[PDB]
């Protein structure tokens, strides 16, 4: 079975605050604020259908890790994942 890369931290936001966090993301107010802003913009973004958030996942890919962000609907779920 396929090898899934390690998680490096989680963050759950429930506007505006940190509801839960662990690992690299634990009590990191700056990251939580910056994610919250990115997510609000991404959520407000429309391609060609007003009644459609044009993503099911937002991923921010860095050299060694990626932040995987899902929204529903006033909460934000973040996993920091090692790259494959």
């Amino acid at each position: 079975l396929e090898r899934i890369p390690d998680q490096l931290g989680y963050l759950v936001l429930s506007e505006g605050a940190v509801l839960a966090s662990s690992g690299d993301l634990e009590n990191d107010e700056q990251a939580a604020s910056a994610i919250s802003e990115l997510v609000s913009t991404a959520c407000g973004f429309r391609l060609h259908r007003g009644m459609n958030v044009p993503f099911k996942r937002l991923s921010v890919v860095f050299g060694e890790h990626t932040l995987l962000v899902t929204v529903s609907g006033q909460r934000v779920f973040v996993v920091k994942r090692q790259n494959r």
Binding site: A34, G44, L47, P54
Partner: protein, 89 residues
């Protein structure tokens, strides 16, 4: 950064790429094709800028990807030029 019209055209040649757009830190629509146009340029510029705040770069400039069932929009800054590409799956 130098000319960029040629790159927009070559990129669109890919049969899954349905849109491309370049902006800067200001949100200037520096050229777009296909599915991405003026009303998208601003939000695209803001996203890249907001995503950059998620690191104090090890020279680690992120790619922002908005993933949908049908395709993806991939956004990266390089350099002072922000390039968004709309791909079908």
């Amino acid at each position: 950064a130098a000319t960029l019209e040629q790159h927009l055209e070559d990129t669109m040649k890919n049969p899954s790429i349905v849109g491309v757009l370049c902006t800067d830190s200001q949100g200037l629509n520096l050229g777009c094709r296909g599915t991405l146009s003026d009303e998208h340029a601003g939000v695209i510029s803001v996203l890249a800028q907001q995503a950059a705040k998620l690191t104090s770069d090890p020279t680690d400039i992120p790619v922002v990807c908005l993933e949908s069932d049908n395709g993806n929009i991939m956004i990266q800054k390089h350099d002072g030029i922000t390039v968004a590409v709309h791909k079908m799956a």
